[PDB]
């Protein structure tokens, strides 16, 4: 439960061996429920987008939209338990530093809160960072109480590079997930038939991010 102990005795060895690490009961029921309440309040007050355009119909009232998102800094009114989550994620990662491969983590994104609305949409197979944009670790926290994928779908399926197999991860309440963001971990979200919430942060590697600046391209006027 102390972040350093979880980091050294579980996350570091699990990440270095498998590139994927699942931590259940990360924050406990009380805090997890508070975060759920904050995310549902965001949803109920219209703070999410309308959802990824999945099917563009000739009649636009027929369009199908999928995952909805909102970006959260962690200090907004009504988001402070999400901020607490983000701090706890940061504490874990920082207590791994120097031991997650050869990466040196020096920053992260804001939190991306995602809501799959339960209409049979998921997320196609993809790699989070396929082109060297600086992101080395993906961290996802799940909020869905009593989630059963045989009933509601929504499994996260990862295809770790170099295996004739995949890893199915249920989006279970108070579950934290780490995985390498690059091509080692292509993954997909299978169709969700119930409202499915998750909060993602990506962590940056100092070297990769520093040279991403070059490739991706700040101008000083003359
Ligand atoms: O939610 C999950 O278990 C896994 N989700 C994703 O891998 C995922 N990845 C990306 Cl890059 C996006 C990107 C935008 C919106 C939602 C995403 C998402 O749910
Ligand atoms: Cl093992
Ligand atoms: Mn992804």
Residue numbers in the entry: 188 to 404, 410 to 414
Question: What does the primary publication say about this deposited structure?
Answer:
The ferrous iron and 2-oxoglutarate (2OG)-dependent HIF prolyl hydroxylases (PHDs/EGLNs) catalyse trans-4-prolyl hydroxylations on HIFα subunits, thus promoting their binding to the von Hippel–Lindau protein (VHL), a targeting component of a ubiquitin E3 ligase, and signalling for HIFα degradation under normoxic conditions. The PHD-catalysed hydroxylations of HIF-1α/HIF-2α in higher animals occur in amino- and carboxy-terminal oxygen-dependent degradation domains (NODD and CODD). The three human PHDs exhibit different NODD/CODD selectivities, with PHD3 being substantially more selective for CODD than PHD1/2 (refs 16). Biophysical analyses employing crystallography and NMR reveal that the molecular basis of PHD isoform and variant selectivity involves enzyme–substrate interactions involving β2/β3 loop residues (that bind the LXXLAP motif) and helices α3 and α4, regions which display sequence variations between the PHD isoforms.
Using biochemical and structural studies, we identified four more residues in α3 and α3-βI loop regions (PHD2/Ile280, Arg281, Ile292 and Gly294 that are substituted in PHD3/Val102, Leu103, Val114 and Glu116, respectively) and which play roles in determining selectivity. Indeed, we found that FG2216 (IOX3)35, used in clinical trials for treatment of anaemia, preferentially displaces NODD over CODD from PHD2.
